[PDB]
Write a protein that binds this ligand. Structure first.
Ligand SMILES: [Cl-]
Ligand SMILES: [Cl-]
Ligand SMILES: [Mg+2]
Ligand SMILES: [Mg+2]
Ligand SMILES: [Mg+2]
Ligand SMILES: [Mg+2]
Ligand SMILES: [Mg+2]
Ligand SMILES: [Mg+2]
Ligand SMILES: [Mg+2]
Ligand SMILES: [Mg+2]
Ligand code: NA
Ligand code: NA
Ligand code: NA
Ligand code: NA
Ligand code: NA
Ligand SMILES: [Sr+2]
Ligand SMILES: [Sr+2]
Ligand SMILES: [Sr+2]
Ligand SMILES: [Sr+2]
Ligand SMILES: [Sr+2]
Ligand SMILES: [Sr+2]
Lengths: 154, 95, 160, 140, 186
RNA sequence: CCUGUCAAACUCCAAACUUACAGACGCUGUUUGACGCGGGGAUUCCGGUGCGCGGGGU
RNA sequence: AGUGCAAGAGCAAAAGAUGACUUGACAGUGUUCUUCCCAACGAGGAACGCUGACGCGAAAGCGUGGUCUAGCGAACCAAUU
RNA sequence: UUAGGCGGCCACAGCGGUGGGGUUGCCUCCCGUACCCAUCCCGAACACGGAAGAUAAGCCCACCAGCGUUCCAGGGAGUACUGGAGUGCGCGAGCCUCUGGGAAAUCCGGUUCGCCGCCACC
């Protein structure tokens, strides 16, 4: 399970790529989604590679992000342990976060919006003109590297 | 194109590889297909009769009956539905 | 005409003589020089002139550079010295010139050129250890008559 | 082994390449059977503009008709070594040609499952000379 | 053979046993083929149908197994051929086969030949096969009368191992009589 | 035998890639009716630029 | 190699050669594709059927001209069946 | 299949080569022209009739890789080329990095001297 984050805008980006991002339930910059690692899903992130930031997040970081940015399928309602308890199949955020990573369920399946609408990266990101290996912020990330981003955009 | 005939630019698709030269095996020219059967269209260079328009090579239609010994295969060119008259010699069963 | 008009590879490969007529003869007099009866493996030293950029070299330059190179080898090693040089490339690319403005612009055949990719050996000489400095000089004169910068690389020379 | 290997006469073809006929009458009387005309292909400057048209004739003799002819034909010739085909055949002279071969030749002359005769079973110039020479005459 | 560009014929063409051009025209009918093949000593007749991995023989008959019904005569003549056809045609009727098209392979369509005799027998057995009467041999020659009259020009016996001196085309009659009979273990 | 070079109108080879059909995942539709069909009304048929691949031409 | 003619393509117990017989280069009416990729548009064209009448072949079968892609023409009026 | 018929795939099956196999069995070569049929001339072939002989051909069986072909391992090569991205480099033709793919020639060692279906048959 990887965490996708659109870091580059829609203007001038190929249509077949923009459509993929929308199929992955992500419509705006800074929006994040949790995608399972399957053959099909793998082909999709590869296509989006240059306009996104992805990687497997740590249980902790995911719990932080879920608590702060997750939303119901409709409404403002805060997604906290109490919420998770009365609507999901889990006991608390940690239970949910674990199931996601282990790929046993999805946010939509539990009645949560498939998108985590994140805040801009505090202290800014490493740039949208280069990949990770070049000091940029685009493409695949280290579990530690992705966390730094998600936590920065908490 | 310099001209607009049916065989325009069909130099490659309508030619056999050296070892595939000469008369083709009868088996596939007599094959029987059923309605609803998915079939691949590909003109056999060695067989003169029963061909379809070269523009349709590569299509995968659906047998929807036959006219004489030839078959009536339904296809979708772009967004337009078309019915193609083709003999078994130029057809292969999908899968 | 300037080489600037033909040096770059900016047109399709135009070589098919069965469709092109009136192609001018090659000014390149010879491709095998020195002692062509003796083998290349009979020489201790093998030095080649390597083109650093991918270009098109007209037969006029091929001849001019080949000439100024071998002419030096003759002067320094005699007309029958113990060496043998080679021009491995041949002018296959047919050139045109539109010489009525841009209407019916397909030009007429004016010459031929050899396409050479970067890193390739245009020339390759074979000499004895004693004559290595003369061949290096022949090539120094040869690269002054062709468009790209070149390297004078030794492929068989522990004698230094 | 020796039996299904000893050579025989396949056919004896007597032919006269004229070029424009009246010669059919002599071949008929000399061989014993009726002859056939010979045509041609490709236009020739030696007055042969008509493609399909009589130029000569021939007669293919087999069995008795062949031997009975050869008994009186061979004496008329002065056989040589060079006059032999690599297949063990020979021609001399009105030309006379003798086609020689080993027993199971039908394998390559039939229609069903025909096959070309192996080189080890094909007659040789030497094996031919011998067989022929061993029948009323001399070689070289 | 020579190189990569070389074209080697189909195996059954290489072997010169199958005429593919005629095989196609044959297959077009949709009916099973009454394969009529010969041998120096024997005659065979197969009822062949088309199959996913090769042909299928639904019924057949060899002139050798003709003796299994009371045949003391040779097996490479006209009576033999006709009878082999009738036998094959009968086994065919038994298997559900009702019609067929004559496949003579690389044999010649000579008037009165054995393959036409083979065809006449299969038709007589009850099979619907497209034919042409005036291409079939005279009923007497089928019986083997041409051979009985040949032995008439005796002085020396036609047959080696004694079957009979003057031969018996009546044996053909006796055998045909036997096959047409409803019983008989096919 | 050896040795030196090529091909838009060559090919014993041969991609990336484009493409037909089907399944799966995704997205989407069944009160926001998709897909499709029928009808009314257009405007439009001087385009331009960047990038990739081009063809002509210094 | 040959297969009438550009070029590309097809063909070897043939689609080529020879021989013989024959006139299907037939009448009527369609299906489909093409012409016009997608996507509407005529004449023309081709593939594939049916009805009728035929040729050849033992028969399956082949023949709706020439192995395939060029060789073509509206309304009005005239002549013709 | 102790030798057969019809095939599918249509060279992994081609080309070339070595060895073995047939009393009333099989396929052949073979023997022979009264007939059916046959040759623009030849019972050569085609067609018919038949066994004195033979296993030399063919065919069937076993095996060889020199040529051709199929596939595999390693090398060439993640090279050549390439779909996506870059305020990366270069006067420029052009190159590079990241991401997703990925040859060809050739070398070397293996493989391949057909596989399979139906019927019949000591
Ligand atoms: Cl079509
Ligand atoms: Cl047979
Ligand atoms: Mg909401
Ligand atoms: Mg700040
Ligand atoms: Mg910045
Ligand atoms: Mg092309
Ligand atoms: Mg008018
Ligand atoms: Mg008129
Ligand atoms: Mg032997
Ligand atoms: Mg720059
Ligand atoms: Na073919
Ligand atoms: Na002008
Ligand atoms: Na029309
Ligand atoms: Na004549
Ligand atoms: Na043998
Ligand atoms: Sr250009
Ligand atoms: Sr320079
Ligand atoms: Sr394209
Ligand atoms: Sr035609
Ligand atoms: Sr004979
Ligand atoms: Sr890979």
């Amino acid at each position: 399970m990887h965490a996708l984050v659109q870091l580059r805008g829609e203007v001038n980006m190929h249509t077949d790529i923009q459509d993929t991002l929308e199929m992955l339930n992500i419509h705006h910059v800074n929006h994040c989604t949790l995608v399972p690692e399957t053959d099909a899903y793998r082909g999709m992130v590869a296509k989006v590679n240059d306009f996104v930031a992805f990687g497997e997040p740590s249980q902790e970081t995911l719990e932080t992000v879920l608590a702060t940015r997750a939303e119901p399928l409709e409404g403002d309602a805060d997604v906290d342990d109490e919420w998770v308890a009365e609507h999901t199949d889990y006991d608390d955020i940690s239970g949910l976060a674990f199931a996601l990573l282990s790929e046993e369920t999805t946010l939509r399946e539990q009645g949560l919006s498939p998108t985590l609408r994140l805040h801009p990266p505090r202290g800014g990101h490493d740039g949208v003109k280069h990949p990770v290996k070049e000091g940029g912020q685009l493409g695949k990330h280290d579990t530690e590297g992705i966390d730094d981003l998600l936590e920065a955009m908490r | 194109p310099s001209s607009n005939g049916p065989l325009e630019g069909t130099r490659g698709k309508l030619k056999n590889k050296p070892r595939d030269r000469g008369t083709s095996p009868p088996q596939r020219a007599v094959e029987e297909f059923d309605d609803g059967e998915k079939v691949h269209l590909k003109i056999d260079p060695s067989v003169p009769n029963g061909r379809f328009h070269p523009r349709f090579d590569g299509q995968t239609g659906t047998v929807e009956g036959k006219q004489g010994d030839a078959y009536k295969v339904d296809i979708v060119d772009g967004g337009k539905e078309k019915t193609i008259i083709v003999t078994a010699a130029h057809l292969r069963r999908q899968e | 005409k300037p080489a600037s008009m033909y040096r770059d590879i900016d047109k399709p490969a135009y070589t098919r003589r069965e469709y092109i007529t009136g192609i001018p003869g090659s000014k390149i007099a010879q491709h095998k020089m020195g002692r062509k009866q003796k083998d290349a493996d009979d020489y201790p030293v093998q030095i080649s002139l390597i083109v650093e950029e991918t270009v098109q070299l007209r037969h006029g330059s091929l001849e001019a550079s080949r000439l100024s190179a071998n002419r030096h080898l003759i002067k320094e090693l005699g007309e029958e010295g113990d060496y043998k040089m080679t021009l491995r490339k041949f002018p296959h690319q047919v050139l045109r010139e539109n010489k009525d403005g841009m209407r019916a612009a397909f030009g007429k055949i004016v010459g031929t050129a050899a396409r050479v990719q970067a890193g390739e050996q245009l020339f390759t000489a074979y000499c004895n250890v004693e004559d290595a400095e003369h061949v290096k000089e022949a090539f120094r004169r040869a690269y002054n008559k062709i468009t790209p910068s070149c390297r004078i690389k030794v492929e068989r020379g522990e004698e230094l | 082994f020796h039996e299904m290997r000893e050579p025989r006469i396949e056919k004896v073809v007597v032919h006269m390449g004229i070029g424009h006929a009246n010669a059919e009458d002599i071949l008929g009387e000399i061989t014993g059977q009726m002859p056939v005309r010979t045509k041609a292909k490709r236009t020739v400057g030696e007055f042969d503009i008509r493609e399909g048209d009589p130029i000569g004739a021939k007669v293919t003799l087999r069995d008795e008709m062949a031997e009975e002819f050869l008994q009186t034909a061979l004496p008329l010739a002065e056989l040589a070594t060079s006059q032999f085909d690599d297949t063990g055949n020979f021609s001399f002279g009105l030309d006379v040609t003798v086609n020689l071969v080993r027993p199971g030749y039908r394998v390559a002359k039939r229609d069903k499952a025909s096959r070309s005769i192996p080189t080890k079973h094909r007659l040789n110039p030497a094996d031919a000379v011998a067989f022929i020479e061993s029948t009323y005459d001399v070689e070289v | 053979a020579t190189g990569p560009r070389y074209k080697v014929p189909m195996r059954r063409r290489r072997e010169a046993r199958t005429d593919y051009h005629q095989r196609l025209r044959l297959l077009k009918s949709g009916k099973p083929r009454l394969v009529a093949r010969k041998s120096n000593k024997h005659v065979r007749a197969q009822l062949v149908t088309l199959g996913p991995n090769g042909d299928d023989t639904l019924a057949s008959a060899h002139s050798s197994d003709l003796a299994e019904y009371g045949w003391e005569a040779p097996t490479g003549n006209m009576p033999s051929a006709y009878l082999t056809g009738l036998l094959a045609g009968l086994r065919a009727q038994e298997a559900g086969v009702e019609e067929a098209v004559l496949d003579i392979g690389l044999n010649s369509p000579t008037p009165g030949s054995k393959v036409f005799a083979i065809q006449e027998g299969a038709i007589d057995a009850g099979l619907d096969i497209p034919h042409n009467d005036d291409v079939l041999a005279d009923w007497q020659r089928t019986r083997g009368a041409h051979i009985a009259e040949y032995d008439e020009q005796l002085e020396e016996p036609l047959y080696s191992g004694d079957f009979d001196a003057a031969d018996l085309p009546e044996h053909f009659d006796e055998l045909r009589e036997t096959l047409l009979d409803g019983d008989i273990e096919l």
